[PDB]
Amino acid sequence: GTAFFQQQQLPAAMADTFLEHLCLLDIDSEPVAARSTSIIATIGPASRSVERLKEMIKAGMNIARLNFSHGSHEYHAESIANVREAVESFAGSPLSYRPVAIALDTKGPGSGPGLSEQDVRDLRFGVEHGVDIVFASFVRKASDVAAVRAALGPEGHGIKIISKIENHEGVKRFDEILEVSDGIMVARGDLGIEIPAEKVFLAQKMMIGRCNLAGKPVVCATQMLESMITKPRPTRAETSDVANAVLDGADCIMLSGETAKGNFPVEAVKMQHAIAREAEAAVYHRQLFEELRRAAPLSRDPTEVTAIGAVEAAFKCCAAAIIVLTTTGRSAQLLSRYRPRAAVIAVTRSAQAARQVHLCRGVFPLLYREPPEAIWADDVDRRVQFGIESGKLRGFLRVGDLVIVVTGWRPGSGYTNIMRVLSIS
Amino acid sequence: ELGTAFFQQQQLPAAMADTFLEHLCLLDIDSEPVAARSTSIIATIGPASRSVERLKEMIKAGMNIARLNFSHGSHEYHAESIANVREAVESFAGSPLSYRPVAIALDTKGPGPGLSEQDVRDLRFGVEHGVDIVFASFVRKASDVAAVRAALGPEGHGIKIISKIENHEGVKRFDEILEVSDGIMVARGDLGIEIPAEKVFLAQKMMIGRCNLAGKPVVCATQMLESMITKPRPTRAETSDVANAVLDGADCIMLSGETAKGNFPVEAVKMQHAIAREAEAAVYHRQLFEELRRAAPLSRDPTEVTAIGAVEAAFKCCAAAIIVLTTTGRSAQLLSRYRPRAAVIAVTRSAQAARQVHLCRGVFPLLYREPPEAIWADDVDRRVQFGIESGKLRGFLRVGDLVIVVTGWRPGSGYTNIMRVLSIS
Amino acid sequence: RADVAQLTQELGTAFFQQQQLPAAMADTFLEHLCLLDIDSEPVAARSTSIIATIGPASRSVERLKEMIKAGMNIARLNFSHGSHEYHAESIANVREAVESFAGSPLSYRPVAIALDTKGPGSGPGLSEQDVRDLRFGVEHGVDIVFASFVRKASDVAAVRAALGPEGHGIKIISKIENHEGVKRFDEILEVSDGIMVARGDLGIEIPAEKVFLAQKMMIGRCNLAGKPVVCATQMLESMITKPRPTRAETSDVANAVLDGADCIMLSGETAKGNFPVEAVKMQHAIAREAEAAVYHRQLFEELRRAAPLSRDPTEVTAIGAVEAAFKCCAAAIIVLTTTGRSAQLLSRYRPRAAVIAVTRSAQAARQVHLCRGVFPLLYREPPEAIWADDVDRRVQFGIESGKLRGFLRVGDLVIVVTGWRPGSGYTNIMRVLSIS
Amino acid sequence: AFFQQQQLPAAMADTFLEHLCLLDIDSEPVAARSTSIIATIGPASRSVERLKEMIKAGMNIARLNFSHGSHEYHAESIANVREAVESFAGSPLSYRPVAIALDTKGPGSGGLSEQDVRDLRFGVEHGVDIVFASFVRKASDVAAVRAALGPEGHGIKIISKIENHEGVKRFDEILEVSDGIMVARGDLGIEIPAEKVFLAQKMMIGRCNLAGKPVVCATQMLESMITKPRPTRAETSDVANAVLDGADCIMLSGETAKGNFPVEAVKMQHAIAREAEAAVYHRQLFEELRRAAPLSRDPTEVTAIGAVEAAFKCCAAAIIVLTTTGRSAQLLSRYRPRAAVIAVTRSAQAARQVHLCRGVFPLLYREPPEAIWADDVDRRVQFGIESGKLRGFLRVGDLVIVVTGWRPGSGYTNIMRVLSIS
Ligand SMILES: O=P(O)(O)OC[C@H]1O[C@](O)(COP(=O)(O)O)[C@@H](O)[C@@H]1O
Ligand SMILES: O=P(O)(O)OC[C@H]1O[C@](O)(COP(=O)(O)O)[C@@H](O)[C@@H]1O
Ligand SMILES: O=P(O)(O)OC[C@H]1O[C@](O)(COP(=O)(O)O)[C@@H](O)[C@@H]1O
Ligand SMILES: O=P(O)(O)OC[C@H]1O[C@](O)(COP(=O)(O)O)[C@@H](O)[C@@H]1O
Ligand SMILES: O=S1(=O)Oc2cc(O)ccc2-c2cc(O)c(O)cc21
Ligand SMILES: O=S1(=O)Oc2cc(O)ccc2-c2cc(O)c(O)cc21
Ligand SMILES: O=S1(=O)Oc2cc(O)ccc2-c2cc(O)c(O)cc21
Ligand SMILES: O=S1(=O)Oc2cc(O)ccc2-c2cc(O)c(O)cc21
Ligand SMILES: O=C([O-])C(=O)[O-]
Ligand SMILES: O=C([O-])C(=O)[O-]
Ligand SMILES: O=C([O-])C(=O)[O-]
């Protein structure tokens, strides 16, 4: 229909140049796709209530950040319990349940040269309380990441390490840091004090570009909607900053004081949701996909080969979604790195992987709770149907839509190798 | 994993160039072709190429399609040519390494305002003798194709009609002719008399471009190696002409007097084979694939969606082949339209489809004759392994190679919707 | 490397490490982003003009002299507040501060004066107060009018009529502030000299989360049309009370420049804030960094592909001059202009080289601040008897001012743009000159 | 009507594939034929009357093959070429210069042979414009040819013929010291597998286009025309594809030296080249040549790119350039403008030699001098305009780009002007 091609900035998407793409952006072209950039909300006195946490989950919070610069271990254990209680209050409806990750943001090294003694204790607390992600403060070199990994011990091997780049040395040694990290946070607060404030946008754009090239998550952080700590509506510069972080290629956007201590935590999450959805439709996928493909090296990994084939197929048919089965999140991450317009619906039995895949743009995790079927092919089919039923309930899919289904040839992680074109019935 | 030697062969340095100009600058006479020759060779049968022993040498030299020119000879003469071609082809059924299907094409005498009485009788002879293709002479409009289609009686609807464009009217009404034809022949002999000789290259390049855009076979014909009718080696202009027809995008190249009446028919076939193999490696796939992708409309047909995903996947891993199961040849034709560097190995139970897919560049037909398995998934797996084992025997594949496999979700033509990445064991 | 190897040997590796030149040479936009370097210092003069709103914090002659030194190019008078007497005094103070630097013609910096109208309010068109304010503007010789709440082409015709026959030279910049203005943008731009993306009212008239789409669309269309576009409101808002801006504010300024804005604006930050000079300095610092980060390779290619073929010799000369400047990394393009039009046509192709515009018109010298990368030089000498000698003297004045200000050094290449006869509309010559 | 001619619908296409789809046999060429024709002189093309017909048919360069004939034979060929060329000098606005090229016998089983030293000396003494040096395998072979030409042969252009595997492999070092290259497909097709010659041709043409140096495609282009009045379909395709590849010149050997249809062979190359030049996809070609040409601080190079960009912006009918050595015209030619490059020169030798550069139309200036240098420059520009109008290149209302310098003498081109005709 003609109505379909007028929505989600599709006239601007078909433009032959980036300049013509800008000229065709339309304020009346409504977003249809689900919001793909994850929202990280910092927990604090304004967002610790179990009832308030339920509202923030409904507003779109995907990752709850625990800032270990404030409060004791007892305070953070209560924050974790409250987040889990609010998240699990929706588990009674499996088709709409939204996993929420818990990230531990370290206090940092301070005047020390590396991992502080308080950080070693906090990291151990994180492993004992089952946190999903660590946002490691003031990462300056690859050995800082190795120290965090060692402090997590053998029980914390599955925790994702997102290195925070906060100073000149971190920016200069970025490549070596990214190589050993799971992802990066552009920590603009400290970065804007360590380097001239007028240069922060260059460091942000460079780091986002390099993370997009590497296929690793990147988070944009600090003062994105700062005035909403006290005001019900943000400034024109703040809405612009959120939109531009998404357009730059950020996988996640963050709220700090806006959700930790402000008077509008739910509204700040709703505002980031609304802006991100508009900005995602305005992405010039024609150039972005071409450049990501051209820059990505040749691969003999079947998961990577299936992912690029699936993303190409999704663009060819305007697929509503790519449904992928994943144990660790890796198959969903490899689809996400090619920035499809189609939502990546990731079905997993791992509660931890379901929480962690929020780090990857456009990955919508679905936690499958049913025990395995005796026939493996039936178990695979039941999970694909669960993805379809959840997608229909949530508005991602309708009867008549085309979907790309990504699975593997045997049970266990690492064997994705099949892409299938399915019509929704 | 692959080695530096791998990346020096098949013009791979020129393939990785960022511009067409740099691609030309990187072409290397020492970079040897490795892929099997993908442009089919059509040889005209006549006194110099009619004997069974001569036809066996032409099949070994690379002849894929035998052309019967109905402008000369009786029905009895042509029936004997067909019998000799079939005897020569079937003499290799005892060795899978040497057996190759060979299509039989009937080239009509021509028109009068429309279909001549002789053409009606010759087309009826074609249906009765089971020819695979008709090269329809002097097609000037869509109704000329409809007349040929109607003359293929109740038994010949599966015969491919390749319209020969031989005059100004055929060039001017090209779009309406291509729409109703299975493919086109650029009949340069008559075209060069009907329009100024210096304009034939424009008509050739335009028709090849439009056929490539439509995904329909196009044949370049007449005087390609003309001097080889009396000389053992061709001129510099003749080798250039063959290479440029392949670079232009021709699916097939043809020999007329060179094989029908000349003194060196086998050498003419060998020369076209040698040039086509060099020219195919020199194709600038980076721009070709991007432009075919951009110009092809969005599609909701699962065969078309699977085909572009499979070709994208094959480029990502430098796949040795794309193995496709096809009953009519259509799934192989849709892969061929995206011009993959990987060979398209088409496994079919239809002897007719196996001969006809020689019209599509890079399609290597394998005729499967095993009785059908009771469990359909087992019959599919047996055909995929048949394509892998044939590929290993013929030199296309080795253990450790990656192949893309294209199949559908249920039996019957029209359901192709699956692409898998397999590692050869 | 082959395309820059000889010039790298000649100009040095240090030259090619500055002004984001490694990012400029990238083959893709993604690689361009990956190569942006916080250690790559800007060298070129700041090309995006700064509009500062005049008020109690920036009205004194001494304060205005510091703002001119900090980088203010256009002084905005907001007619929503203050009487005609108040605004006349602001104009006098701006002119006194500007003319305090006239003693040195080789370094004099012109400053434009813009009148921002109160608006229609609940009315359907031009209000009676706006008619009186526009007449005040003509009588006091303002250079630009920022017309509030422009909704259609007839609104700009009403502003033009209210300026009368004596205000024909004043530039009309239409402020787009509501849904109707965005929807009828093409008809408004066609009859306006330029556009202001008035984000304050726009963010109340349409959903706040859609303002960035309207901003990017309007900037893109103005860049395609070759007409000035201003980004306005809350760019450095927190600087009204704080000495340093937020991370979102610096990002907003940088992104407005990267989007393609010709001008950026300060409202409360300069009119009533505690750090007006620091706010101007911050916009100057961010704009210089962002201008160097522009991906000229794609921008120039797209401006050429989208611009229609032209038989206008000024337009043909402009693209040839910008192409020549990129080929040699020219320090500047020196252009002679009567109305500013030849400089505007060079500016539309977004050269990295500064466009040094030599003019005898004091008004054109102030108005060309609306065009990105145009550095006006007011030539005060009387005409030579031989016209060709007069042209040569003006080109030499541009070279001498360029050397004095640091734009040009001995050994640099400059592109010189002139015409074949006196009078506006005859630019048709491009020359490559080596600075001695 | 303007936008339907010279393959302009195909020129405006957004992709190369769409460009091919839009090529039209009814879209007539309008621009003058840009690719020069080299005709080999022999028994079929030696008489003054035959040479006059070949000049009218489009021959730009006369090739003397020193593999056959004595010095006396070649001196007579040169005299006949000059007599035929000068028979048209009475009309200066339409006079067409014709270059004379000496093609050496080669080294045989040997570097520079003793016969080649004598033949090269003969060339200098008889004022030849170009040397086609046979079997060039390395840079020292070019240096030997240059030394054999002596101090009097400094101005002669050396076009190195690449005829074997070593020449192809050491191409970069050969091109660096040569004025241009000839893809000598005859010997190349015997030295390397015949099926690989097209790769060597396309690579050498691409590298010469990148370097901004002339490249000639040679041998068997219209071979069947030695005995037949019309060429084969492969031969017309070969000529068209050499032009599309980027060849500056195309050549005729036996077709003009000994064949029965020498004039018809020249006419056929002219007709094909004109059609192929209009089919060039300038949108991609200019972008790639512009991107790949290095950044430069040479004012002639800077002015040249600015002038070609300006010509494309206004669909300029021509770029008129004043040149002493041909260099300013060569630097414009390297960007492959659609606009004809009309080169006004006083040097008769430079006028003959610029036929090596595609799209350069030499005009030999023989009008009385002006006392004021600026008036003399203006008069040469008006001469280019008047010759252009007479020859059909220009009409009243057209826009032209004019390229001049700031002072007399070679090396000072730095000005580009947009001029409206009449
Ligand atoms: O993304 P990951 O971690 O590699 O998981 C993908 C795996 O999921 C599957 O699709 C389903 O596997 P399970 O049945 O073990 O859940 C496998 O075939 C595939 O290897
Ligand atoms: O190319 P075609 O003619 O559409 O045939 C493709 C068909 O081949 C298959 O892969 C195998 O089907 P069959 O078992 O009937 O041969 C189907 O799943 C698919 O629809
Ligand atoms: O940019 P504008 O307004 O067209 O002015 C450009 C004009 O300036 C000149 O360079 C100099 O003209 P004047 O001598 O009148 O100042 C003209 O040749 C040219 O037409
Ligand atoms: O192309 P070349 O050999 O550099 O010649 C270009 C020269 O021709 C001119 O345009 C005219 O010079 P002359 O008057 O000496 O002929 C010079 O200004 C310029 O330097
Ligand atoms: O769509 S883009 O051409 O323009 C942008 C605009 C932005 O405002 C920000 C980012 C991009 C972008 C980022 C990429 O990595 C890329 O490969 C292409 C782009
Ligand atoms: O590889 S190409 O850019 O250059 C060619 C060169 C030829 O010599 C011939 C054809 C092509 C070509 C054809 C296409 O349809 C296309 O989409 C791209 C190309
Ligand atoms: O340099 S760009 O490709 O990427 C941008 C990135 C932005 O962040 C913003 C704008 C652009 C841009 C704007 C254009 O009009 C254009 O023609 C090209 C560009
Ligand atoms: O696609 S092109 O127009 O771009 C070029 C660009 C170069 O910079 C060089 C050559 C070409 C070219 C050459 C051909 O033979 C051809 O068939 C097509 C081309
Ligand atoms: O720690 C942080 O998030 C910062 O400095 O922005
Ligand atoms: O019939 C043919 O093949 C021709 O005319 O070229
Ligand atoms: O008036 C203004 O400038 C606004 O609303 O932004």
Ligand SMILES: O=C([O-])C(=O)[O-]
């Ligand atoms: O000498 C030549 O011209 C050849 O060998 O092609």
Ligand SMILES: [K+]
């Ligand atoms: K912290």
Ligand SMILES: [K+]
């Ligand atoms: K026939």
Ligand SMILES: [K+]
């Ligand atoms: K106002």
Ligand SMILES: [K+]
């Ligand atoms: K010779």
Ligand SMILES: [Mg+2]
């Ligand atoms: Mg910090």
Ligand SMILES: [Mg+2]
């Ligand atoms: Mg025929």
Ligand SMILES: [Mg+2]
């Ligand atoms: Mg307003």
Ligand SMILES: [Mg+2]
């Ligand atoms: Mg030879």
